Paper text:
The type VI secretion system is a widespread mechanism found in more than a quarter of all sequenced Gram-negative bacteria, with one or several copies in each species. This nanomachine transports protein effectors directly from the cytoplasm across the cell envelope and injects them into the target cells, both prokaryotic and eukaryotic. The baseplate-sheath structure is anchored to the cell trans-envelope via a membrane-associated complex. TagL is a polytopic inner membrane protein, and its PGBD locates at the periplasmic C terminus. TagL interacts with the TssJLM membrane complex through a direct interaction with TssL.
In this study, we solved the structure of the PGBD of the EAEC TagL protein. A sequence alignment with selected sequences corresponding to known structures (OmpA and Pal from Acinetobacter baumannii, and Pal from Yersinia pestis) showed that the TagL PGBD is restricted between residues Thr440 and Pro552. Crystals of the TagL PGBD grew readily and its structure was solved by molecular refinement at 2.43Å. TagL PGBD crystals belonged to space group P63, a = b = 75.9 Å, c = 177.7 Å; α = β = 90°, γ = 120°, with four molecules per asymmetric unit. The structure of the TagL PGBD consists of three α-helices around a four-stranded β-sheet with connectivity β1-α1-β2-α2-β3-α3-β4, β4 being antiparallel to the other β-strands. The surface of the PGBD exhibits a deep crevice defined by three loops: Lβ1-α1, Lβ2-α2 and Lβ3-α3. Among the five residues that were previously shown to be required for TagL binding to the cell wall (Asn494, Leu497, Ser498, Arg501 and Ala502), the residues Asn494, Leu497 and Arg501 locate in this crevice. Superimposition with such proteins in complex with PG fragments (OmpA and Pal from A. baumannii, and PorE from P. gingivalis) strongly suggests that TagL interacts with PG. Nevertheless, the residues forming the DAP binding site are relatively conserved in TagL, especially the residues that interact with the DAP residue through hydrogen bonds and hydrophobic contacts: Asp486, Asn494, Leu 497 and Arg501. As expected, the structure is highly similar to other members of the family; most importantly, the PG binding pocket is conserved as the residues involved in DAP interaction are structurally conserved, which strongly suggests that TagL binds to PG through DAP interaction in the same way as other members of the OmpA/Pal/MotB family.
Author numbering: 441 to 552
The structure:
């Protein structure tokens, strides 16, 4: 089960954007429906900056979404597996714009 993308990050940030909670809650409801599944949290970035820093930054966005569901959703940290894609695999053109915001995201997939 692949959950709706979570574009919750501003440029250079791994902390959640204002307005992010409503979307994290929607994802948390979907996780509560699949109790016991492996929760794979895959982080992404836009093209701006060095690709290796973007790889590191993508892992931190994945860890932040994981710790929100761990502490603000009461789910054991052992249920998650954090992943980072860096700037590879963009969903929209990275020439700044709203597309670059679409690339600063976290994809959650549930593995039975």
């Amino acid at each position: 089960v692949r959950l709706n993308s979570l574009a919750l990050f501003d440029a250079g940030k791994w902390t959640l954007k204002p307005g992010a909670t409503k979307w994290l809650v929607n994802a948390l409801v979907d996780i509560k429906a699949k109790a016991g599944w492996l929760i794979v949290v895959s982080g992404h970035t836009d093209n701006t900056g060095d690709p290796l820093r973007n790889q590191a930054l993508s892992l931190k966005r994945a860890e932040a979404v994981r710790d929100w569901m761990r502490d603000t959703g009461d789910i054991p940290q052992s249920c998650f597996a954090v992943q980072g894609y860096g700037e590879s695999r963009p969903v929209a053109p990275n020439d700044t714009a709203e597309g670059r915001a679409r690339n600063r995201r976290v994809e959650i997939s549930l593995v039975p």
